[PDB]
Structure 1
């Protein structure tokens, strides 16, 4: 999401999260959901318009920012972004750091993008929440992305967690749920400061995994728990390969050396396992000669 702050007291020492939509920025304007007061001699009463576009689907995958546009409102002393004069018709920016000078004000408004892309585990969940989050500047999606910061698991309806959840946990993504989304549905009209929505996501995550037999204590104890072992699967996606890598496994992807060198087959007279079955073991027992001894029992038998 986009945030602005400034040096000096030109924004009253406060930062602000800017959602998609339009703001009028100026000396004689009151801080509400669509106006930003910036007090300095050389800033016009109504000085600039900032327009933030809503995110595209691509940004969920690239981690790119919402397009940020600046128009100068025919002012006395002009507007610059990153030292470039804003012309008539304005300019648009897709960089993640903008230094915006209004007039001759010696202090710049500093706009920066904080990464936040939300993956959903369920298509009906995505369709219900996507428009809501997009209006906050938060890209969303279903498929795997390297720009994902948060992952929404389905209601753990007294049942097993999905591979998407297991994967998110392991790559150290913050796992959230419905209750945090309900919180986000609260905030569009609000004027709130930098990092306002992030810690609640971490609190949600920490509470989710507490007393939960689908999770161990941390990603750290799961990571490399199967080192020394090796496996094989059919047309492994790079995500499932990375998932198995994170468990410390040696992987051989296929389309006498597939059989006796490889300890088991992961799926979707050889010995086969699902990732779902592998997760059950990856939690269960204690040590490296215990939590990897039940997996070593399933191989010999």
Structure 2
């Protein structure tokens, strides 16, 4: 998101978030969702046009900013951006840092890009929110990205948190839900006038951990809590692989379940199964080895006992 700020009284001492759209900047306009007042003497009645475009396809993956367009409105004294004269048919900027000077006025309008990219847990929630967030200048997606700052979990009364959510939690990502997204959309226009009115994602996130029995005390407790243990794992999602590695697990990945040699048993402490293979193939899985789902493993992880809990369960199924 583009934030603008000024080092005089010229923006009233308020930061503004500039969502995708078009803003008339000058001294005779008021404060709309589409008008910005700037008091100074050397600036025209209607001085500048700021136009913020919606995110590019790459912005989710690069973290780069929405295009910021600056048009001078046939001004006597002109407009400058980064000390270079804007004129002609305007200019468009892709840098994260913009110094905008209007006329001979020494107090400058400073645009800066604050990172916010939102990953979703599934296609269903994405479809529900994509276009909306696109209009708020927030890149969205399903794939992993080094630019992601926030992850949206599916909130559901019945079941476990998903693997996606377990992983985002352990990766140290801020987790948010549907209701934060509702909040952000109702206060859109108010936040343009005052950046500090921006809904706080950390409050939503801290509230989720507190109100939920499906989250450990801290991501830091879990990381490397199972180092020293090794497990075998039938195929599974790539989220599942990386999740287990963060827990400090040595991972062997078999395919058939009939790929279980004496080799594996002798060097594997327990085994992680898909939901499907766990329920029906209780007739054909190995006799000595402890078997659990990712869902159950996570429930072990939440406990204070984790290692003592798995240890004594290997000793139960070995005698």
CA distance in 1, matches of 2:193, 2:318: 54
Q: Summarize the Cα distance change of 1:292–1:161 in structure 2 as closer, same or farther, 3 Å threshold.
A: farther
For the 8 Å contact 1:80–1:101, the answer to whether it is kept is yes
Separation in structure 2 between the aligned mates of residue 117 and residue 289 of structure 1, nearest angstrom = 39
Q: Deviations over 1:164-216 (max 9, x none)?
A: 11111111111111221211220233244665466532222222222422111
1:63, 1:115 within 8 Å by CA — same for their partners in 2? yes
Asked if structure 1 preserves the Cα contact closer than 8 Å seen for 2:10 and 2:40, the reply is: yes
Q: Is 1:203 equivalent to 2:203 in the alignment?
A: yes
Distance 1:97 1:179, change over 3 A: same
Verify the 8 A CA contact 1:32 1:191 in the aligned structure 2. no
Give, in whole Å, the separation in 2 of the partners of 1:233 and 1:126: 29
Higher helix share: 2
User: TM-score when scaled to structure 2?
Assistant: 0.82
Bigger shift: residues 185-194 or 266-275: 266-275
C-alpha contact (below 8 Å) 2:33/2:193 kept by paired residues: no
**How far does residue 102 in structure 1 lie from its aligned partner after superposition?**
1.2
CA shift for structure 1 position 249: 2.4
What 5-or-longer segments of structure 2 have no aligned partner?
256-261, 274-286
- Partner Cα distance (1:194, 1:299) in 2: 64
Cα root mean square deviation, aligned: 3.1
Change (3 A) 1:122 1:45: same
Residues 1:237 and 1:113: Cα distance change in structure 2 (over 3 Å):
farther
Normalised to the residue count of structure 1, the TM-score between the two structures is 0.87
Deviations 1:101-157 (A, max 9, x none): 111221211111111111222222211111111111111112222212121111222
Deviation at 1:54, TM superposition (A): 0.8
| Deviation string, structure 1 residues 35-93 (Cα, Å, up to 9, x no partner) | 11112222222111111001133212221111111111121222222222213111111
1:287 equivalent to 2:306? Answer: yes
Q: How many equivalent residue pairs?
A: 300
8 Å CA contact retained: 1:5, 1:16: yes
Checking the alignment, whether the CA contact within 8 Å between 1:81 and 1:98 is kept in structure 2 is yes
Alpha-carbon separation, structure 1, partners of 2:14 and 2:272: 52
Bigger mean CA offset, 190-199 vs 139-148: 190-199
Report which of the two structures shows the higher radius of gyration computed on alpha carbons: 2
**Mapped partners of 2:150, 2:87: distance in 1:** 38
Q: Which moved more, 1:271-280 or 1:229-238?
A: 229-238
Aligned partner of residue 196 in structure 1, secondary structure = helix
